[PDB]
Structure 1
């Protein structure tokens, strides 16, 4: 509620209004504080969900999901600091403003009270993200990532507004989710498929199916300095949750056609992870993880029958961190050596000993050792999706193999002798290198102690 948007918009002139170089520490100081407010009135119910205003129930829903969104902001200025210190302050004042200008809508969205505040705010980004990709790129291939990032996201999300304005005047008012207490079903026709297909395909083009992901590595391979907005674009994607607000209801009873979204993404899950093994560019190698065990949720959501939402929620915020943090490693190791080519960096682990245990705990949580959230987020997937049909144990059982050769080959490539020609790579990871790389593995594993705070209603 205004408890949140108002201070975080109050942030906005906490920055430029300041002096010279004090700016970074000025806003990083406050931006942490809001996290007390983040929890503050939140983590109330529980049962019979919280709605505190007419057009906002901040998050009740058991999709808390908002606490993270308020984390990643003052993880950027620790992240983004590296080469952004080399241009002017009135531009550096900008890049902190639009970056907030993103953070303000992700608080608006995830609440939205309804469908039609979601959408205009579901499309309300792409103004702030697109401007961070095109400027402050690195290569010159960036200019095409500008377009491809649109012309999909916007391409098929217009058929929403044709459909959601079609519901508003058909049955009552969509003004509120919390009233669905009248919903008739959707039986069949050659019209209703389209309705269901229009109310869906806009979401898929964000969390990729194995088709129409053609943009995802185009934008991430070449993308701002620190992953500065690349950490944010790994929040944006998973935020396609809203399919959890719809497909639970609002055409419940068409599962009839589900199968082309099952067998299409269920054989890609065994697939695009395997086209990730021979990659020669590291920020590509991680970008294809992000498809894979993200695209497993799309077979979690379509199937009804909780024990999937038990396991589908834990995943949106499962790689929400692990897949975040890897883009933070591959950034750092790139500061020192200016190729992103994976081969070139070898013979590390002697020269940066403390950063050894940083790779490991990262690459260990794609392996998903049993105790952490990762498996307890996957093993509620397999338990329901097994009951669907027994044969799902094979493919998604293969996923649990190729992903293990997948991860290690990234670490074990950095255990070798190489002294080779590098006179660079002196800096022994000054604190920010290891400070911002923490505040992930500390908060991540921690939740396993009381992991009832990440769960759906079911």
Structure 2
């Protein structure tokens, strides 16, 4: 992936040239176009050049990250009009895109760890610099410390695996297997916190409500997918310890996602409800990963890609209504159909995508992740039916109470929808309904 990385490395000096924000967006969408034309990847590692290569898993993750970052520039126009350090913001986005491409193109696990910890810094910069509330300092510190406290012993695990095997390459590490409990806990707890388990989620709504949309989308669409891609790499050589210790994580991640789904029914903040919605569907992803079935891994990767697209799309809607109504809640934003009627179509087309939407990739990820949990045990049926029922109970309450009913009758005059916002909502929904025609690039990574 040297051409993409050098393209972005020479896209770096466009930040220092003024009035070039949309030019950087145009060339990043050109990168996404070229990366659409680079698809020839299969199971093993292809296009190998200077420790960089990808399989279908990493191809889909780089394509998702490139699509999210280009949309993020399109989403963040308030940086451009107020001139709120747009050069520093563009440089942060391009460097974070380099770090996410480099942690996804890693043939060895230590580049994945190194650029995975490097990607925490521009996200922390986005949190601490481009928010709007005094609790920015509470947000980036929770993100940084909840990531670092569990990601620091995983470095000791990495060096323990390296001494035992002698290499970090993902195929040479597939041959070995380990029967150590603490090695399993080090190599799992960092991904178990980085993608939120119910007991360790805390940092997620604090990082999401405070964060700017260009900063909430990179936490929702990706960077929870680092904690899924890490398990997709790690569980291959820790299968016996995973069969010893899966049931506690499956029980926690299936009780959460019901409790988490009951939380969203009793919350009024629009950005916090999508923040807890990221916990519940990747509770399904986390439950499907630790069952090592082939359908579990394939449907897990499908729901990672599709859930990233629909959660970033749902966080797109929560900032359009925020900048027009001054502050977001359920009470202020009640019934926006009479204010913005054309925005309501994307509101339902992306809130329905958060649950099982019929021609989207969210349903195809969800229909095959339920297969692994049902084939795992029949006890899990009771707490899956409640999970999906309460899932579409809360995610239809979002559209339901925000887009129907009487107006607030205390709001002032705001601007209407623009060409940028409808184009922004289109590129989150129509990829969810268009990649189902070639879902094997997002199902089969094996």
Above 0.5 in TM-score?
yes
Secondary structure at 2:26's aligned position in 1? helix
Q: Tell me, which stretches of 5 or more residues in structure 1 are unaligned? A: none
Aligned counterparts of 2:22 and 2:59: Cα–Cα separation in 1: 32
What is the aligned counterpart of 1:179 among 150, 167, 172? 172
In the other structure, the counterpart of 2:61 is: 65
Q: Which has the larger radius of gyration?
A: 1
Q: Is residue 231 from structure 1 mapped to residue 217 from structure 2 by the alignment?
A: yes
With structure 1 as the length reference, what TM-score do the two structures score? 0.92
Q: Give SS of 1:334's match.
A: helix
For residue 98 of structure 1, report the CA deviation from its aligned partner.
1.0
Residue 189 of structure 2: aligned partner:
201
Deviation at 1:280, TM superposition (A): 1.6
Map 1:196-275 onto structure 2 (within 5 A): 196-224=184-212, 227-234=213-220, 235-240=222-227, 241-250=229-238, 252=240, 254-275=242-263
SS for the counterpart of 2:421 is helix
Q: Structure 1 pair 146/423, CA: closer, same or farther in 2 (3 Å)?
A: closer
The corresponding residue for 1:127 is 121
The alpha-carbon distance between structure 1 residues 344 and 162, as it changes in their structure 2 partners (threshold 3 A), is: same
Q: How many pairs does the alignment contain?
A: 443
1: CA distance, partners of 2:438 / 2:412 = 47
In structure 2, the CA distance between the partners of 1:121 and 1:83, relative to structure 1 (3 Å rule), is closer
Checking the alignment, whether the CA contact within 8 Å between 2:41 and 2:55 is kept in structure 1 is no
| CA distance 1:181–1:26, shift in 2 (3 Å) | closer
Q: Which residue of 1 aligns with 2:112?
A: 118
Assess, with a 3 A threshold, how the Cα gap between structure 1 residues 38 and 419 changes in structure 2: closer, same or farther: same
Gap change, CA 1:205 and 1:254, over 3 Å in 2: closer
Residues 248-304 of structure 1 deviation map (CA, whole Å, 9 limit, x = unaligned)? 124545411222111111111211111111212111111110100111111111111
Residue 7 of structure 1 is matched in structure 2 by: 7
Matches of 2:373 and 2:404, distance apart in 1: 38
Larger mean Cα displacement after TM superposition, 70-79 or 413-422: 413-422
Structure 2 length-normalised TM: 0.94
Find the counterpart in structure 2 of residue 286 from structure 1. 274
Q: Is the 8 A contact 1:280 1:341 kept in 2?
A: yes
Residues in 2 aligned to 1:375 and 1:341: alpha-carbon distance in whole angstroms: 28
Shift of 1:230: 1.0
Equivalent of 1:109 in 95, 103, 109: 103
Instruction: Specify the SS of the correspondent of 2:332.
Output: helix
Tell whether the 8 Å contact from 1:59 to 1:110 is kept in structure 2 after alignment: no
Q: 1:75 aligns with which of 51, 71, 74?
A: 71
Deviation at 1:318, TM superposition (A): 1.6
Partner SS state of residue 123, structure 1: helix
Q: State the Cα distance separating 1:106 from its structure 2 match.
A: 0.8
- The answer to whether the 8 Å contact 2:68/2:312 transfers is no
Distance 1:60 1:434 in 2: 31
Greater Cα shift, 52-61 or 122-131: 52-61
Q: Distance in 1 between matches of 2:380 and 2:286?
A: 14
Of 20, 40, 56, the match for 2:37: 40
Whole-Å Cα distance in 1 between the matches of residues 68 and 233 of structure 2? 24
Q: Once the two structures are superposed, what CA deviation does each residue of 1:38-83 show, in whole Å capped at 9, x if it has no partner?
A: 1233x21435542523512134457622111111222122211125
Pair 1:282–1:48, CA change in 2 (3 A): closer
Does 1:137 pair with 2:131? Answer: yes
Give the counterpart of 2:304 among 305, 311, 316: 316
* Distance in 1 (alpha carbons) for counterparts of 2:294 and 2:379: 19
CA RMSD of superposed structures (Å): 1.9
Matches within 5 A, 1:373-384: 373-384=361-372
Normalized per residue, the structure richer in helix is 2
Structure 2 residue corresponding to 1:355, chosen from 305, 329, 343: 343
